[PDB]
Enzyme design. Structure first.
Site: not given
Lengths: 270, 270
Positions: B14-15, B77, B156, B188, B190
């Site tokens: 993942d980035s 990603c 995050e 997403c 997240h």
């Protein structure tokens, strides 16, 4: 993300007619996919035959469908899956799927108390294919395997709703209702036709796993993985059945099980 | 049926750190599989970058894990999936899976009234990746796509349980609660950390689809298809994380999200 529209059919092969329930599930789960099916009824059953023979016959059905243009192959036969799947999968350039692992995977996920059962023909049961696959995933599972000798005859005779069927299923599964099994694998493709009776006998607290249905579930994922999906604008335009035995008997059985009217059945030679 | 025990790890790239939720799902769904993860935080985000750059960086993470011994690759990603997955999948000899299609497949199956929604970053939403994939499967679907700009920062910052988070989610999704949507894709990686809040805001009648979780579901099937499963006797013995950015920050985030104590995080260079 380049998506390719591929209207080539998905192929299904079986020594007999049991695999028709797998096609039934494909028609429901994959409404836009074309279908080709071959039932080698002129040489059914494969079970008693030596591996060399089973592999030869399975290759003949495979070759036939590949030449008819299939883009993916589903081996709906337990014996062919256990004996010839590996060789055929390694040799062809198209995806090839069997029925045992998908059902095993679903059973492992569904069970809560780890008491898993599996019913099928005596050949399937004695091979221990399901017990081994189940234990290779979860060693703690308590697996009960039970052969149901007459189930196939009841279904192939289109008497899966009769009093005889209810009696046969009830008496055959009796010893299976006292082991606290919460998950039961239908390890024979003929069994989905007896599901209502099986469910009643086992109880509402028992989750039944249709291996053929789970196999079609894998096919759905593989169509995306290999970029082989047909498009909804095309839709299913082809559903053809081939049999090496009596087309008349095959059609009688197929139209009854699928319950969708007239079907295209052609007698062929392999 | 020759089953091969393969204890090589499954790789995830993942980035950034969002992909950690995919690893979280892998730890739960695949208890016997070893795991390797790389987060290219030193170059995150990939979105604004030209394709040439995204492909180069994704190849660097891929090469790193392949050399570390992975047997399968999961690109967690969205940008890498949309831009580099096809090239990498074609070139490598190991299976490679992305996150978009698995979630799309699950959404199509779950929806009943055909009113499907998808939330994600503005980049994901503007790319129309999900709408296109959804429509390619079912053209009749009414798809509502909504960017949720601040969700990532809230997660995050490890504030996904705060009053600020509840406020941000409630206000951002408000216009999405009046379209009779019965299925919402968390587009997403997240977002799983905000699921309880998202569920509350959308209502109990809305089924949420976790794309990362669905992707891990595909991995489970592919391990069987490619004969790459590890055995339960071996079990998971390795779970290592690599980051090109701050190992300290990565560990702070990872340990909080996974909630399983100390994790192995190593700073690397690509």
């Amino acid at each position: 993300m380049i998506r390719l529209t591929d209207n080539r059919p998905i192929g299904f092969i079986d020594s007999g007619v049991g695999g028709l329930t797998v096609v039934k599930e494909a028609l429901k789960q994959l409404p836009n996919e074309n279908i080709l099916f071959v039932g080698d009824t002129a040489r059914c059953p494969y079970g008693p035959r030596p591996a060399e023979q089973v592999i030869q016959y399975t290759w003949e059905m495979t070759d036939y469908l590949v030449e008819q243009g299939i883009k993916m192959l589903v081996i709906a036969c337990n014996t062919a899956t256990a004996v010839a799947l590996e060789e055929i999968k390694a040799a062809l350039s198209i995806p090839v799927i069997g029925v045992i692992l998908p059902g095993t995977r679903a059973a492992v996920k569904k069970t809560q108390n780890k008491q898993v059962g599996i019913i099928g023909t005596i050949g399937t049961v004695k091979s221990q294919a399901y017990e081994k696959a189940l234990k290779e995933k979860v060693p703690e599972l308590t697996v009960t395997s039970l052969a149901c000798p007459k189930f196939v005859s009841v279904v192939e005779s289109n008497e899966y709703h009769s009093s005889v069927a209810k009696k046969i299923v009830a008496e055959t599964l009796a010893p299976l209702t006292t082991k606290k099994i919460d998950t039961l694998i239908l390890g024979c493709t003929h069994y989905p036709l007896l599901r209502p009776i099986i469910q009643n006998v086992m109880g509402e607290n028992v989750q039944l796993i249709d291996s053929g249905a789970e196999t079609v579930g894998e096919v759905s994922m593989l169509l995306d993985y290999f970029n082989l999906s047909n498009s909804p604008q095309n839709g299913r335009t082809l559903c053809q059945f081939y049999t090496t035995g009596s087309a008349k008997l095959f059609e009688e059985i197929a139209e009854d099980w699928l319950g969708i009217g007239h079907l295209n059945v052609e007698h062929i030679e392999l």
